[PDB]
């Protein structure tokens, strides 16, 4: 059964698919080893904050637990990198309280996509720069993230990074328990700092999760060849057998 | 055939059960060679078509008596393009095309939900309610069919929150299309079921209408009336 020239169309389609796939894997592998570059470049600033935030012996539990911050990408083909975080979020919101309460900030369309239809939205972030996340326009989110305090005690949701592509989703928390007495300046510069680091590790995941999801596809696509190469040969055979049988059977007729 | 033709033209309605009408045409080619005939496509008898025409129309109901016939049609090498079953198609008012794929899926009877047809599917025959569901099922089964290459390459991750739903329904609908055949039991050990038409029509409605979008697939596998699915559902935990 089936065609031949319809088996070629499939092979070549698959091939050009594997191509485009493996392209992006390498491309997203090129965006892992630039995540360090902006990961490193942030190593010092973090050190020289906890060193400052050494904490004198001389805002603890205020009232509630309210808003979240949910880190993602705008682009797809990342494996579950999105759905996962967008699960914990959706769980420990509805595992939380069930009024229209418990509010939200999202980074990357894909997040805002689900969050939108569900309700409880607060802010927006689109077009993060990819491997180089611009520390700048995340600074506008620290402001919204803090000044929002209209708020109490936020948690941040994203994926961590351990060794190339292997990763896991987390809730580290932040806005609680870890001139003179200038907290008006450390409170802010300690959130701007965390929401940022969160990204670098988020993105590091993104590219990774994509680097892989674009391997799984490549690898799989490559198997689609085997499954077709086989059905092509078979249809290559029955065809060359029918053609011949036709050419002889038309001679014996003479 | 002549047997059934008796009760039809000499007296009542008749059920003609012909098991593998293929073997007729098949044996045909066996002789066609020795007759000194010019072989046709695939090496079949140059008369294959007509030889079947002269034995089909005979199996028909008249103003005298009625003949409801059900014929088993073997598919050589799973090729529906083979002259035997191919040529046979234009001989039936209703077909049930069985697929090996669906069979290994565990879907029994393994019946193509998008291939099998009947002249009955008309609103002018089966009623509107039964019609629209009919296509509704097929619609969502096809929409799942198209999606399959992506799933097979990219998994379900990059599908929309709308296409995913269609993947669930479709599956569970393609599973509910499985049935317990009384002539099974001795093997599997399950008893069996005859699902009334009103209950099939309804069962799928709810599924398309989403009363069941919570129940896992496996619950819908190998059952009768839709109620049973709910039963076998809780049994799951």
Curated annotation (Swiss-Prot), chain A:
GO cellular component, one term: proton-transporting ATP synthase complex
Protein name listed in UniProt: ATP synthase gamma chain
GO terms assigned for molecular function: ATP binding; proton-transporting ATP synthase activity, rotational mechanism
Keyword set, alphabetical order: ATP synthesis, Cell membrane, CF(1), Hydrogen ion transport, Ion transport, Membrane, Transport
Assembly mode: F-type ATPases have 2 components, CF(1) - the catalytic core - and CF(0) - the membrane proton channel. CF(1) has five subunits: alpha(3), beta(3), gamma(1), delta(1), epsilon(1). CF(0) has three main subunits: a, b and c.
Family stated for the protein in its record: Belongs to the ATPase gamma chain family.
Stored HAMAP family: ATP_synth_gamma_bact
Membrane topology type: Peripheral membrane protein
Gene this chain is encoded by: atpG
Major localization listed first in the record, in broad terms: membrane
Biological function: Produces ATP from ADP in the presence of a proton gradient across the membrane. The gamma chain is believed to be important in regulating ATPase activity and the flow of protons through the CF(0) complex.
Pfam families found in the cross-reference section: ATP-synt (PF00231)
Biological process per Gene Ontology, one example term: proton motive force-driven plasma membrane ATP synthesis
Record's subcellular location: Cell membrane
Organism the protein comes from: Geobacillus kaustophilus (strain HTA426)
UniProtKB/Swiss-Prot annotation, chain B:
EC supergroup of this enzyme: translocase
Enzyme Commission (EC) number: 7.1.2.2
Statement: the UniProt record of this protein carries the keyword Acyltransferase: no
Organism, as annotated: Geobacillus kaustophilus (strain HTA426)
Gene Ontology MF, one: ATP binding
Membrane topology qualifier: Peripheral membrane protein
Name under which the protein is recorded: ATP synthase subunit beta
Main location: membrane
Reactions mediated catalytically: ATP + H2O + 4 H(+)(in) = ADP + phosphate + 5 H(+)(out)
GO terms under cellular component: plasma membrane; proton-transporting ATP synthase complex
Subunit note: F-type ATPases have 2 components, CF(1) - the catalytic core - and CF(0) - the membrane proton channel. CF(1) has five subunits: alpha(3), beta(3), gamma(1), delta(1), epsilon(1). CF(0) has three main subunits: a(1), b(2) and c(9-12). The alpha and beta chains form an alternating ring which encloses part of the gamma chain. CF(1) is attached to CF(0) by a central stalk formed by the gamma and epsilon chains, while a peripheral stalk is formed by the delta and b chains.
Range covered out of full length: 233 to 470 of 473
Function (record text): Produces ATP from ADP in the presence of a proton gradient across the membrane. The catalytic sites are hosted primarily by the beta subunits.
Subcellular location: Cell membrane
Cystines in this chain: none
Keywords: ATP synthesis, ATP-binding, Cell membrane, CF(1), Hydrogen ion transport, Ion transport, Membrane, Nucleotide-binding, Translocase, Transport
Annotated family: Belongs to the ATPase alpha/beta chains family.
Keyword Translocase: yes
Organism placement in taxonomy: Bacteria, Bacillati, Bacillota, Bacilli, Bacillales
